Amino acid sequence: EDYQSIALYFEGEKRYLQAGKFFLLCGQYSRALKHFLKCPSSEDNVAIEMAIETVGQAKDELLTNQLIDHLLGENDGMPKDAKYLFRLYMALKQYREAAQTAIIIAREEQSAGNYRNAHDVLFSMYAELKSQKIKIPSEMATNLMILHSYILVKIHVKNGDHMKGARMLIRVANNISKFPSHIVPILTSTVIECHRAGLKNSAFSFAAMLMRPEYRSKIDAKYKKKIEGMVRRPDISEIEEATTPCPFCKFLLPECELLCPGCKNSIPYCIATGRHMLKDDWTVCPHCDFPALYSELKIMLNTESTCPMCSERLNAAQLKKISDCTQYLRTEEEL
Amino acid sequence: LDLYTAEQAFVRCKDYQGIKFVKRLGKLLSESMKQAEVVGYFGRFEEAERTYLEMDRRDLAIGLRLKLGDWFRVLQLLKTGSGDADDSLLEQANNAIGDYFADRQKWLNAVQYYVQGR
Amino acid sequence: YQYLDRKLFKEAYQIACLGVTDTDWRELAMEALEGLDFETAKKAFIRVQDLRYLELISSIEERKKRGETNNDLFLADVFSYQGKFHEAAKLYKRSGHENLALEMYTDLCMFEYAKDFLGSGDPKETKMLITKQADWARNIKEPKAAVEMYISAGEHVKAIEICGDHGWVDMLIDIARKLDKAEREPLLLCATYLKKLDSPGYAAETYLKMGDLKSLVQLHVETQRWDEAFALGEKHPEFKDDIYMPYA
Ligand SMILES: [Zn+2]
Ligand SMILES: [Zn+2]
Numbered sequence: 038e039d040y041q042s043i044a045l046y047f048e049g050e051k052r053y054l055q056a057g058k059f060f061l062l063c064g065q066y067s068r069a070l071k072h073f074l075k076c077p078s079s080e081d082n083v084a085i086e087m088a089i090e091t092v093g094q095a096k097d098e099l100l101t102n103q104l105i106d107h108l109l110g111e112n113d114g115m116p117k118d119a120k121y122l123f124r125l126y127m128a129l130k131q132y133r134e135a136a137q138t139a140i141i142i143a144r145e146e147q148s149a150g151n152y153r154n155a156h157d158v159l160f161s162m163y164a165e166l167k168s169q170k171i172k173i174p175s176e177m178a179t180n181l182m183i184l185h186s187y188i189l190v191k192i193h194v195k196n197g198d199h200m201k202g203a204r205m206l207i208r209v210a211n212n213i214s215k216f217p218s219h220i221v222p223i224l225t226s227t228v229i230e231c232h233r234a235g236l237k238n239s240a241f242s243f244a245a246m247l248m249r250p251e252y253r254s255k256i257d258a259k260y261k262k263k264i265e266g267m268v269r270r271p272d273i274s275e276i277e278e279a280t281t282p283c284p285f286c287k288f289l290l291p292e293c294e295l296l297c298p299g300c301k302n303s304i305p306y307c308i309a310t311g312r313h314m315l316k317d318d319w320t321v322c323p324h325c326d327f328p329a330l331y332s333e334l335k336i337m338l339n340t341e342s343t344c345p346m347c348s349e350r351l352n353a354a355q356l357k358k359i360s361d362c363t364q365y366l367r368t369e370e371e372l
Numbered sequence: 373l374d375l376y377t378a379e380q381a382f383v384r385c386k387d388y389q390g391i392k393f394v395k396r397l398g399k400l401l402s403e404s405m406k407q408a409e410v411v412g413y414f415g416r417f418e419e420a421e422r423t424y425l426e427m428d429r430r431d432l433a434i435g436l437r438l439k440l441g442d443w444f445r446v447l448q449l450l451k452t453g454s455g456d457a458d459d460s461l462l463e464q465a466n467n468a469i470g471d472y473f474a475d476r477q478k479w480l481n482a483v484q485y486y487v488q489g490r
Numbered sequence: 491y492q493y494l495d496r497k498l499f500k501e502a503y504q505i506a507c508l509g510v511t512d513t514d515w516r517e518l519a520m521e522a523l524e525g526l527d528f529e530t531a532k533k534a535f536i537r538v539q540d541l542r543y544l545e546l547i548s549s550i551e552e553r554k555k556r557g558e559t560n561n562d563l564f565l566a567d568v569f570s571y572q573g574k575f576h577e578a579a580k581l582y583k584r585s586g587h588e589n590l591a592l593e594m595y596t597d598l599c600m601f602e603y604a605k606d607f608l609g610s611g612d613p614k615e616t617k618m619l620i621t622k623q624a625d626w627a628r629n630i631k632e633p634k635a636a637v638e639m640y641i642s643a644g645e646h647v648k649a650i651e652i653c654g655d656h657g658w659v660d661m662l663i664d665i666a667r668k669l670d671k672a673e674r675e676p677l678l679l680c681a682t683y684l685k686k687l688d689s690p691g692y693a694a695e696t697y698l699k700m701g702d703l704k705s706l707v708q709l710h711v712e713t714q715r716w717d718e719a720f721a722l723g724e725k726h727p728e729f730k731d732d733i734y735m736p737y738a
Contacts, residue, residue: 175428179454211457246490280556286399289556295456296431298552299399303431370402370427380629383599388570389542391597412541439544441536475507475533 039063057084066091067100074103077113085121093128101129123162132171139166140176143184150218152187159184160325160346167326172369175303182295182306183212185346189311194230196339203234204293205311210243221247221255229260232267238275244268284316285366302368308345309333319362324349328365331358373406412436421445431455443469463489494518499527503534512538519543523568526561546571560585570594579607592619599626617643628652641665646676654683663692672700685709694722704729711737 040062047053048060048069057070070091073084085108092101104125110116119142126135139162146155159181166173186205193201206227209216213224224247231240244264247256256264278291286300292312295304304313308322310333320331325347334356337345344351359365375394382390393413400406404427412420417440424433430453437445438461446465450458466489473482491514493502499522506518519534528547535543550564558564562585569578575598582591588609595604601623608615624639633652640649646669653662666680675682681696683689690713697706703722707729711719716737723730 172428175430176454179456182456183454208456211460212454214459214462215454249490277557286401291556300401301405301432302402303429368402370404383597386573386575386598388573388575388594388598392571393542395597415541417541439541439548440539475504 055081055083055087057087061087061091065096065100071100071103074100074107077107077110078115079117082117082121085117086124089121089124089128092125095129097129101125120158123165127165127169132166132169133174135162136166136174136177140174140180143177143180144215147180147184147215148217152184156184156188156346157348164325180215182311183208183215185308186311187216189309189345192337192341192345196337199230199234201310202230203236206230207236207239208293208311221252222257224252225257225264228264228267235274235276237267237271238273241268241271241273281313281315284314284319284362285368300368302370305365307333309337314362314365316362316366319359319365320356321359321365322347322349322351323355329356331356373403373410408432417442434461438465441468441472443472465489494521497525499525499530503530506534516540520572523547524565526564543571563587563590566590575600579603583607583609596622599623601626621645621648624648637661646673647679650676650679650683654680654687657683657687657689659684659687659689659692662687662689663695666692666696667699678702685712704732708733708736 043062044060046059048056052069053059056068057066057073060066060068061070066088070084070088073080073088076084079085085104088104092104105122106112108116108119108122108125119138122138123135123142126132126138139159143155143159143162146158159177163173163177163181166177186208190202190205190209193205206223210224210227213220213227216223224243228240228244228247231237231243244267246252247264248268278293280289280291282289283297283299284304285302286297288297288299290297290299290313292310295306295313297304297313305328306312307314307330308325308327309329312330312333314328315330318331318333320329320334321327322329322344325344327346329345334345335353338351338353338356342350342352375397379391379394382394397406397409400409404423408420408423408427411423417436421433421436424430424436430449434446434449434455437443437449443465446461447469450462450465455461466485470482470485470489473479473485493499493505494517499518502518503522506515515534515538519531519538519540522528522531522534523543528551531547532544535547546567550567554564562581566578566581566585566587569581575594578594579591582588582594588607591607592604592615595601595607596619599622601619604619608619620639620643624636624643624645627633627636627639633656637649637653637658640646640652646665649665650662653665662680662683666677669677669680671677673679677700678697681693681700684691684693684696690709694703694706694709694713697703697709704726707719707722707726710722711733719733719737720730723734
C-alpha cells in the first residue's frame with residue numbers, strides 16, 4: 038500500500054543508508070533521492086542511478102530538469118560523467134538528444150587523445166540506440182566509422198597487411214581534422230605506410246601538407262629528411278584501387294567508397310577491412326550484429342580473441358556466412 | 373511517379389534526356405529518394421536540399437550543392453554535421469570560391485580563400 | 491566567339507567572365523562539351539545552372555576516374571544527349587560499341603533505324619529488338635500489327651495474351667494450330683481463352699491438338715454436347731466413366 042514505514046523507515050537522523058531508496062517506493066520521489074540532487078558531489082552513483090528510474094517513471098517535470106542540472110555539474114562544479122546523461126536521456130525516450138550527447142562525449146574524448154576509450158564508449162552507445170531500434174543519426178554512424186578506421190589501422194599493421202593499413206590511413210588522413218592530438222604523428226606514418234605499400238602518389242600530397250608551414254618543424258625527427266626527399270622526388274605511381282559490386286545495386290565502386298553513385302544508399306562497412314560489404318560474403322559477429330567480409334573476418338581471426346569492434350571472444354567457426362542479407366540491406370527510405 | 377506513362381510521353385517528344393532520366397530514376401530503389409530526384413528535376417533545388425536533409429542524408433545535400441556552384445551553401449552545410457571526407461570537401465570548396473572570385477577580378481576576396489584552402 | 495572557333499576554351503571562358511548573355515554562356519558550354527574540355531564545361535554550365543548537363547558531365551568524369559579512356563564513347567554520349575541521334579550513332583559505331591547505339595534507338599523506339607545496328611547478330615538479341623518493337627506497337631494502341639510483331643519472336647505468351655485481350659477468335663485458332671509441341675501454357679493458353687471467348691467451337695479442338703483429351707472430353711459437355719461427350723469418351727473410356735456421372 039503506501040508503505041509509509043518503508044518511506045520513512047529511518048529517514049531521520051540526517052540519513053538512513055539509501056534514504057532515497059526509502060522515499061522511492063511509490064509516488065514522486067523527492068526527499069532523499071532528490072537530496073542526492075541536492076548533493077553537489079557523488080555521495081553514491083547508486084543514488085543518481087535510482088534517480089534515473091525516478092525519471093524512468095516518466096514523471097516529466099522540473100525534477101527531471103533538476104537531475105539534468107546536477108548532472109552537468111553546472112550548479113555543482115564537479116559533474117561525474119555524462120554516461121548518466123545518456124542513461125537519463127534514454128529514460129524519457131527523447132533519443133534525438135541522447136544521440137547528440139553521445140556524439141558530444143565521443144568527440145570530446147576523441148579530441149583529447151583517448152582513441153580506444155572513445156571507440157568503446159561510442160560502441161556502447163550505438164549498442165542501446167540500435168537495440169531499441171531507434172534510427173541512428175548519420176553523425177553517429179559516420180563518427181563510428183572514422184573512429185573505427187583507426188583501430189583497424191593498428192590491427193592491420195601488427196598483423197602485417199601492408200595495403201589495408203594504407204587504405205584505412207587514407208580515410209583517417211582525409212578526416213584528420215577530427216584528430217587533433219596526433220595530427221602530425223598520424224599523417225606521419227600515413228605517409229610512411231602509403232609509400233611502404235604502394236600508394237606513394239597519395240603520400241606525396243599528404244607529406245606536402247605534412248611539410249606545410251604549420252605542420253613543419255614538428256615532423257618526426259626520425260625520418261624528417263626522408264619525408265623531405267619523398268616530396269622532393271615524388272613518383273606519381275599509385276596502384277589502382279580495386280572494384281567490387283555494390284551490395285544492393287549491381288554496380289562497381291571501389292573498396293573504400295561507401296556512398297554508391299547509383300542507388301545512392303550508404304553501404305555499410307566491414308569490421309575487418311573497412312570496405313563496402315559484398316552480398317557473396319556477408320556475415321555478422323554473433324554478439325555485436327555488425328557486418329564483415331566473411332573471408333576477411335575469418336582471415337583476420339588470427340588468434341586475436343576479441344571481435345574487431347565489440348571486443349568480445351570470437352573464434353574460427355562461431356562465424357558463418359549469411360544469405361538473407363536483405364534483413365541488413367533493406368533500403369532505409371524503403372524501410 | 374508512374375515512370376511508365378512518363379517514359380512513353382518522353383518518347384512521344386523525341387527527348388532522349390527524358391528517357392535517360394526516367395531510366396536513372398528506375399535504378400533508385402527507394403521512395404523519398406525518387407521524390408528528391410524529381411523535385412530536383414523541375415529545378416526546385418532548395419526543396420530538394422531540404423528533403424535530402426530531412427531524410428538524414430547530409431551527404432547528398434553536399435553533393436547536390438557541389439554539382440551546382442553553391443559553394444557558399446557547401447561551406448554552410450560543412451559547418452555542421454560530419455561526413456566521410458570533410459577536410460577534402462572543405463579545402464576543395466575554399467579553392468573553388470577562390471576561383472569563383474578570381475575570374476571576376478575580385479582579389480582581396482579570392483585571397484581570403486586560397487589561404488583557408490591551400 | 492573568336493576564341494571558340496579556334497578551339498581555345500579556357501581563354502574563351504576567361505573572356506566570357508567579363509559579362510555575357512545567357513545564350514552565349516550556353517553556347518560556350520555546349521562547345522566545351524563537344525571539344526572535351528570538361529572543366530570549362532562545368533564552369534559554364536554552373537553559370538547557366540543546368541542540372542541535367544552538369545549531372546551528365548559528372549557522370550562522365552566519374553567514369554573517367556575509373557577505367558574509361560575512349561574519346562569516341564564520350565563524344566557519342568554528348569551528341570546523343572543533346573539530340574543529334576545520328577552523328578552520335580556513327581560515333582558509337584566507330585568505337586567498339588554498337589550495342590550502345592542499339593540501346594539508343596530502342597529507347598527512342600525508332601526501330602526502323604535499329605534494324606541496321608544489330609552488328610552482333612542473333613545471340614538472343616534479335617528477340618530483344620523485335621520484342622521491344624512489338625511492345626511499343628501495343629502501347630500505342632495498334633494491336634493488330636503488334637499481334638504478328640510478337641509472332642516473329644518467341645512471344646506466344648504475349649501474343650496469346652493480347653489476342654485474347656481483344657479475342658481474335660478468328661486468329662487464335664490459326665496461331666494455336668500453327669503452335670505445336672504442346673507447350674504448357676502457350677499452346678494450351680489459347681485453349682484456356684477459347685472457353686472464355688465465345689469459342690467452344692475450338693476450345694476442345696485446341697487441347698485435342700495438344701493431347702489432354704479427358705478433361706477435354708468433359709469440356710465437350712461443357713459445350714452442352716452429350717452425344718459428342720460420349721463420342722469422345724469412346725476415345726478415352728476412363729474419361730467417359732469419369733464424366734458420364736454428371737450426364738447422369
Ligand atoms: Zn549501389
Ligand atoms: Zn563483434
